[PDB]
Amino acid sequence: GAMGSMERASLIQKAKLAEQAERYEDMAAFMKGAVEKGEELSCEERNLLSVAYKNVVGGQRAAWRVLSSIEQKSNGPEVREYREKVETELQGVCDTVLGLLDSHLIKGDAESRVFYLKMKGDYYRYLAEVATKKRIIDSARSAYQEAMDISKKEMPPTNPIRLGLALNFSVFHYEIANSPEEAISLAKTTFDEAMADLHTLSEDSYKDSTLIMQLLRDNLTLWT
């Protein structure tokens, strides 16, 4: 690809520069180039990859929701045409990320496996947000479910990756799978079991875990 001629270390370096500059499309391209080098990603490098594509698709999703809302309000073809254009671009990015996960990253340490399986569920979920669909939802559920099984066996309840996986799998249940009670149960059980495990909250993971715990409580407050 376009990044084939650049050193892996230089791609990682420029991904951090792009992050500081809030150039997330560049950031994602650099990290894709790094994945293409064929070596496994470190903990920090996985974070760079996830943050880059999370922000890229985040902007596309937000734009899609604005256009879809306008489209539904109208019950010419321009609104549909432009919404489909943003939708196609969004799907393309999701396909790019899913391709990286399945071709390179998903294979190992439970921390990395759960990380990538959460991503797989997330980007199938984003595909499901715009799908008009059952296959996509099933693929998201499988990834989330496998990640849940591993994290339950291999990771403590306060681990931020385990917490974030549960937060998103709960959101999946609520607004994708039309299972509000399952979403609520999962969020509550996750929050409660993490609250009883704070004695093992490890200095460099305290801020991430407590942040996600508050996001879990945010959703419970919204849904109950």
Binding site: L167, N168, Y174, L215, D218, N219, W223
Partner: peptide
Amino acid sequence: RRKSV
């Protein structure tokens, strides 16, 4: 809007 991470 509900939270994800």
